[PDB]
Amino acid sequence: RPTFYRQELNKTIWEVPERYQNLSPVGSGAYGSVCAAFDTKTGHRVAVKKLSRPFQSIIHAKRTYRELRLLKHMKHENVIGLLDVFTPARSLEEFNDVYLVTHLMGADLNNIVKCQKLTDDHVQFLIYQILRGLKYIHSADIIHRDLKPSNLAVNEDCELKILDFGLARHTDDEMTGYVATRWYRAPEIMLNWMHYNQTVDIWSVGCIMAELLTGRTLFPGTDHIDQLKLILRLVGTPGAELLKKISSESARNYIQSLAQMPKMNFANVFIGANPLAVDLLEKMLVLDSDKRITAAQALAHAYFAQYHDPDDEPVADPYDQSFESRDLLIDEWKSLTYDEVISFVPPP
Numbered sequence: 360r361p362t363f364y365r366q367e368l369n370k371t372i373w374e375v376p377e378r379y380q381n382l383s384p385v386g387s388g389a390y391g392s393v394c395a396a397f398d399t400k401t402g403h404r405v406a407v408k409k410l411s412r413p414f415q416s417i418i419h420a421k422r423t424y425r426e427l428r429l430l431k432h433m434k435h436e437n438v439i440g441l442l443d444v445f446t447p448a449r450s451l452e453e454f455n456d457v458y459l460v461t462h463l464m465g466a467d468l469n470n471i472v473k474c475q476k477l478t479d480d481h482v483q484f485l486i487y488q489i490l491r492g493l494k495y496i497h498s499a500d501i502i503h504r505d506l507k508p509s510n511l512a513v514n515e516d517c518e519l520k521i522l523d524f525g526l527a528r529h530t531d532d533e534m535t536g537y538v539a540t541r542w543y544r545a546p547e548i549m550l551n552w553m554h555y556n557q558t559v560d561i562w563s564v565g566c567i568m569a570e571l572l573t574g575r576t577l578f579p580g581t582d583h584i585d586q587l588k589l590i591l592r593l594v595g596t597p598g599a600e601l602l603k604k605i606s607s608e609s610a611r612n613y614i615q616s617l618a619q620m621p622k623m624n625f626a627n628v629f630i631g632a633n634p635l636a637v638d639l640l641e642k643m644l645v646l647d648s649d650k651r652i653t654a655a656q657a658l659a660h661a662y663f664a665q666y667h668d669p670d671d672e673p674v675a676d677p678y679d680q681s682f683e684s685r686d687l688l689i690d691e692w693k694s695l696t697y698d699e700v701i702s703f704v705p706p707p
């Protein structure tokens with residue numbers, strides 16, 4: 360057990376191993392507080408996140424367990440990894456606090472687009488890395504559910520990592536109105552049409568790729584209905600085949616109230632883009648999720664010929680998510696989490 364030391368950072372007690380020095384506040388959503396630190400064992404600048412109220416309810420205790428399980432599994436060059444996890448507690452009986460440690464991300468996509476100009480070669484490389492990471496995530500039957508530019512870290516060398524997996528977090532207020540929290544979401548999840556699956560993430564990649572190409576948000580809707588009208592103007596209104604897959608009767612009646620529109624010509628929307636980029640966008644931005652291109656199929660598209668290496672696009676170890684259907688008490692979720700903290704093995 361390392362020695363721990365205590366300090367107060369903005370109204371909060373932090374108790375951390377001596378290896379972590381020069382702690383300085385950076386952020387605080389409703390799920391925790393974050394400090395930057397120097398890790399003297401590894402030489403890395405790191406983010407240290409102290410969870411808030413991790414075991415306050417069954418829903419919160421299960422979310423804490425879910426996040427720790429997911430971060431411990433993800434071992435890929437284009438996905439955020441877990442450097443360390445710790446608690447100052449010396450037993451389950453005194454266990455209350457969880458701290459998560461990752462590499463400090465110095466810039467998101469948004470920061471890079473504002474400070475540098477990108478060529479078509481940059482966009483090939485950025486979208487290639489998102490798809491390489493998604494091939495790995497989907498191979499474990501994990502859905503990210505919240506891909507958007509603020510959830511993509513990018514460095515000076517244009518190297519990219521996916522972060523901030525969807526933990527079933529987002530509230531109704533957060534998704535309301537003229538908000539980037541909704542502009543990258545597939546229409547079947549935005550409107551609760553049907554049981555969604557991993558295809559929702561490919562829609563988000565199409566929206567991100569379009570905005571790297573034009574410099575404009577693809578579907579900047581002022582609300583859910585405005586956004587659906589922008590989507591159907593580009594891709595066309597649904598055919599009988601998709602309408603049958605929409606499980607809500609009211610959702611089906613509403614769509615049938617809209618005048619029919621054909622799919623637009625994507626070469627006339629993405630004026631002057633690489634024809635291979637136009638073709639790949641037409642294969643991602645398909646209304647019927649059954650017919651979208653997959654991450655593994657997209658890596659073999661000719662747009663990525665300069666970067667594709669089928670011997671360097673790895674898949675994940677199997678991931679057991681049977682806990683998602685399990686009914687447990689707060690203290691049972693808390694014990695499972697404690698065991699996962701004490702069994703952590705750091706990366707090479």
Ligand SMILES: CN1[C@@H]2CC[C@H]1C[C@@H](N)C2
Nearest residue numbers: 469472508570574575576
């Ligand atoms: C001018 N637009 C702003 C920032 C870049 C671009 C696309 C969206 N992310 C919003």
Ligand SMILES: [Cl-]
Nearest residue numbers: 361376377378
């Ligand atoms: Cl230490």
Ligand SMILES: [Cl-]
Nearest residue numbers: 438439440462
């Ligand atoms: Cl990482």
Ligand SMILES: [Cl-]
Nearest residue numbers: 448454455456
């Ligand atoms: Cl504790």
Ligand SMILES: [Cl-]
Nearest residue numbers: 507508509539
């Ligand atoms: Cl964003």
Ligand SMILES: [Cl-]
Nearest residue numbers: 677678679680
């Ligand atoms: Cl597993």
Ligand SMILES: [Mg+2]
Nearest residue numbers: 509510522523
């Ligand atoms: Mg985020």
